[PDB]
C-alpha cells in the first residue's frame, strides 16, 4: 500500500479563492488576532447543533462519543493550542473540499471595498486561525469515516488516515502551532478570559484544561 506515498496522492492545492480570502482575513484582522478563538469556537458550536440535529432522526448517532462539548487545552511545552468539540465531525472528503475551497465575489469585493464580523457571516472564520498560527492541523472523525487528519501551513494542504486510529469517538480537534510572537495565547489565564467572553453565547459547555498543583478541566460558561 505504498502507492499513496510514492504518488502525493495526498497533497493538495488551495483554490485561487482561498488563497484570496486568507490574505484578506490576515491583511484587515492584524490589530485584532485574539478573534480567531471566537471563530473555532464559534465552528465547534455549529458542529456540535449539527451532530444534535441528526442525533433526532438517527438513533445511534451519538455513539461514538455521548457528549457535546467544546474543550481546550494548552500544550506550553509543544507550542500548541488545541480546541476539540464532539460535534458532527468531518469525513476525509468533506475535510478536502469544506477546508479547500469555496456570494464569494460579493464578499472577496465587501471585504475590500470592522471585518471581524462579515467573516462570521460569511462562514469562513477558519482562516483567521492562521493570523496566531504557522500551521493548522484539523483531525476529525465523523460517523461514516475513519479519522483523519488535514494539514496546512497555508501554502498548501495535505489530508491522511490518522494512524493513531478513532481517537476522537465523533468530532474535532483544532491544533494550532502558534507563532513564536503568539506565545501569550498558551498562557491559561489569556485563553480562559478569552474563551469566557466568546463562550457566553454557545449553548454546549465549554471547558478549558486548567490547573489548580493539580490539572482538571474548568467549566467556562
Ligand atoms: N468556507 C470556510 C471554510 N469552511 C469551513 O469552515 C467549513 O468546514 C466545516 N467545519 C469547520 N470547522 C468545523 C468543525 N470544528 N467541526 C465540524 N466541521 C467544521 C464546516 O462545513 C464549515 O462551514
Given at each position: ?79 500548541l ?26 464578499f472577496?469585493?465587501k ?15 477558519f ?27 497555508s ?8 494512524p ?40 454546549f ?17
Amino acid at each position: 500500500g505504498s502507492h499513496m506515498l510514492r504518488e502525493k496522492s495526498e497533497k493538495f492545492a488551495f483554490q485561487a479563492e482561498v488563497n484570496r480570502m486568507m490574505k484578506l482575513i490576515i491583511n484587515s484582522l492584524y490589530k485584532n488576532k485574539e478573534i480567531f478563538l471566537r471563530e473555532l469556537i464559534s465552528n465547534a458550536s455549529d458542529a456540535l447543533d449539527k451532530i444534535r440535529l441528526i442525533s433526532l432522526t438517527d438513533e445511534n448517532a451519538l455513539a461514538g462519543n455521548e457528549e457535546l462539548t467544546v474543550k481546550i487545552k494548552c500544550d506550553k511545552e509543544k507550542n500548541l493550542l488545541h480546541v476539540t468539540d464532539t460535534g458532527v465531525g468531518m469525513t476525509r472528503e468533506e475535510l478536502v473540499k469544506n477546508l479547500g475551497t469555496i456570494g464569494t465575489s460579493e464578499f472577496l469585493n465587501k471585504m475590500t471595498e470592522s471585518t471581524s464580523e462579515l467573516i462570521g457571516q460569511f462562514g469562513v472564520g477558519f482562516y483567521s486561525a492562521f493570523l496566531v498560527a504557522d500551521k493548522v492541523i484539523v483531525t476529525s472523525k465523523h460517523n461514516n469515516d475513519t479519522q483523519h487528519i488535514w494539514e496546512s501551513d497555508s501554502n498548501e494542504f495535505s489530508v491522511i488516515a490518522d494512524p493513531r486510529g478513532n481517537t476522537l469517538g465523533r468530532g474535532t480537534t483544532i491544533t494550532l502551532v502558534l507563532k513564536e510572537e503568539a506565545s501569550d495565547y498558551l498562557e491559561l489565564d489569556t485563553i480562559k478570559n478569552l474563551v469566557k467572553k466568546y463562550s457566553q453565547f454557545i449553548n454546549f459547555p465549554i471547558y478549558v484544561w486548567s490547573s489548580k498543583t493539580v490539572w482538571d478541566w474548568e467549566l467556562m460558561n
